[PDB]
């Protein structure tokens, strides 16, 4: 999920573009 | 972009940011 | 355009703290 | 939408609640 | 509403929210 | 306080709202 | 109506860090 | 009031600071 | 005055997260 | 400038990032 | 002001709102 | 640095002006 993606871990512009529609 | 934890308000906040007119979707702890 | 970009900032905020777990989704085109 | 609706008249956190999930 | 930790300014913005047209007040560390 | 019940705690919308005017 | 609830979002945010511990009163009805 | 004094017109930190307490 | 204030706002934090460890400047007078 | 390009047309991320460093 | 660690946006705004008209930089991590 | 000062430190008004222009 982008929480533990992005928010446990370090996420990318591309990683946090996967969670646009 | 920054290389950073990003949670919470600011998570949702880069998501609009970053998706514009396209828009997206949080659902949080999945 | 603007007015209503920054307007969406805010709603986006509120939404996080009110909807929580059960998330949300923020389109509208 | 919620941008017409809350942009325009201010929306308070239970008229906010509608558009979840 | 989330079950979180809300400090600092995510706190008054959350009051802010939360309260409205009635207001509030915050006092911070008591 | 406030900061004590949520911050260092987690806090209801009635919690939350214990502040209010 | 929102021009000064987006506006009071902000507000309240430069009233937190400014006020600090001594806290502040943000009502005005 | 703070409102009406600080959106209408812009507000700096000393300006801010006598809405405190 | 205001409404380029409280856009300035939102700019800035646009900024940080885009810029990242960059940076950038933030002046125009 | 960013204030002109920004506030009044919306700019987005790459259209910020020049704005960068 | 407040006396706390001020980290990633809320050290830009805080920049943003100590600053003003001057202006700032801000660089990140040095 | 600021960060290094105001982050991982706690910062005061007159040492977070220090990084205005
Ligand atoms: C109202 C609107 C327009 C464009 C994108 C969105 O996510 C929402
Ligand atoms: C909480 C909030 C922010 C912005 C606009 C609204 O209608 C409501
Ligand atoms: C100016 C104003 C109106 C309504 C509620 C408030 O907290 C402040
Ligand atoms: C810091 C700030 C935000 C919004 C309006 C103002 O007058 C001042
Ligand atoms: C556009 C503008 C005006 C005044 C100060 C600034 O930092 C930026
Ligand atoms: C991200 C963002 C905020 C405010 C204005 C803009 O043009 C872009
Ligand atoms: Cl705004
Ligand atoms: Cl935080
Ligand atoms: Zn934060
Ligand atoms: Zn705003």
Not at chain 2, 12 to 28: H, I, M, N, P, S
Request: aromatic content about 14%.
């Amino acid at each position: 999920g982008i929480v533990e993606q992005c928010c446990t871990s370090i996420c990318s512009l591309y990683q946090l573009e996967n969670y646009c529609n | 972009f920054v290389n950073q934890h990003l949670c919470g308000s600011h998570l949702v906040e880069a998501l609009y940011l970053v998706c514009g007119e396209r828009g997206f979707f949080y659902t949080d702890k999945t």
